[PDB]
């Protein structure tokens, strides 16, 4: 949640918008300018991606601080929890705050230090050793049985989305584009659209 | 990266050290009170939690601000690629930048707000333990490119143990188990040895 207490104290002079249980305060595709601080009540705040799946990105409460100043390549769409009481920002209005109070400079500047440090710990903290063991195996599988030696190699004609790679094996597709892209890289397989082709299968089976 | 070419402006007033290849910038359990703005060469960070274990966090490279200002309750540990060049601008050192000049200050805002924004689409971007939901994404995969329609039905040729399945997916042997026989008496899907024959594609697709 990242509270900035000290804002409070400044919001007369932000603009103050109000929203109902249900109201929608920001918009997917839509250009964000403000910060906005959360006096009091709660706000859920979807993100959708470049193929229309939504899905959540945090809840934000009393004394918080969400909201793009500048566009962050991110849809946003966020919702109000409860009755919920907004202070908005804007730059220049920042500015101003600033020149009163500059210790405010930094209290901003702590809360997206934590903000960073937080999310950043949780990347770290996904696990993405199995999950890749994980695929592997699934290729290695996948060829041992429906692998049809060509040559040197063994085809597949397997349609097999990243996404459906991910979505069996619970890999984030971070992981997914990397492992594969440094098997393809070390000779031992390449997926193509239609077919993935096996270079290697001695080794893909090491590595498992 | 994240870089602040702005900046680059202003490390005629911070503190410029200089670390060779290997050099350790941050020690474990080192408390930093400095942002490091990184000039040129690479740096590799390490985040060390409660329990000992290392893991990467990020590399960061010419322009790239570093550094925390305050406690962020993350250990980290940081060392040097190559020869590289940085400036250390403290608080004090900070506060003093943003008289000068005002427009630093929401640089470093863009800056962190951009940083918040890429970690926090990683963490949203992930794929809740499932693992049920997993096996039959695997099992619709399989038969909807790999089935061929039998009558009523669509049957594949195809080895599949469940410790392949379970392998694959992560899921326990019980779950495998349990989830296979219900998609049996439910009218879905049975597996045979040589063969697993779906009686219900509709189905199984919409079980995912």
Same mark, same amino acid.
């Given at each position: ?5 000290? !804002? =409070?104290?400044? #919001?007369?002079?932000?603009?103050? =918008?109000? *929203? ?28 959708? *991606? ?25 849809? @946003? ?17 920042? =500015?101003?705050? *600033? ?8 209290? @901003?500047?702590?809360?997206?230090? #934590? ?18 063991? =994980? ?17 040197? #190699?063994?085809?597949? #004609? ?21 492992? !594969?892209?440094? !098997?393809?890289?070390?000779?031992? !397989? ?19």
């Amino acid at each position: 949640f990242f509270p900035i207490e000290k !804002l =409070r104290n400044y #919001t007369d002079m932000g603009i103050i =918008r109000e *929203f109902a249980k249900g109201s929608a305060i920001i918009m997917p595709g839509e250009d964000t300018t403000s910060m906005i601080f959360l006096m009091d009540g709660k706000i859920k705040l979807d993100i959708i *991606f470049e193929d229309g799946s939504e899905k959540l990105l945090y809840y934000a409460g009393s004394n918080s601080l969400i909201g793009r100043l500048y566009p962050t390549g991110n849809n @946003i769409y966020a919702t109000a929890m409860e009755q919920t009481r907004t202070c908005w920002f804007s730059e220049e209005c920042l =500015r101003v705050i *600033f020149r009163t109070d500059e210790d405010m400079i930094f209290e @901003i500047f702590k809360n997206y230090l #934590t903000k960073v440090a937080y999310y950043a710990r949780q990347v770290a903290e996904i696990n993405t050793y199995n999950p890749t063991i =994980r695929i592997l195996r699934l290729f290695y599988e996948l060829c041992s049985s429906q692998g049809k030696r060509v040559g040197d #190699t063994y085809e597949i #004609t397997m349609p097999l989305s990243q996404k459906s790679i991910g979505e069996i094996t619970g890999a984030h597709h971070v992981t997914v584009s990397k492992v !594969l892209a440094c !098997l393809k890289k070390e000779n031992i !397989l390449d997926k193509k659209k239609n077919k993935f082709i096996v270079y290697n299968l001695e080794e893909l089976k090491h590595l498992s």
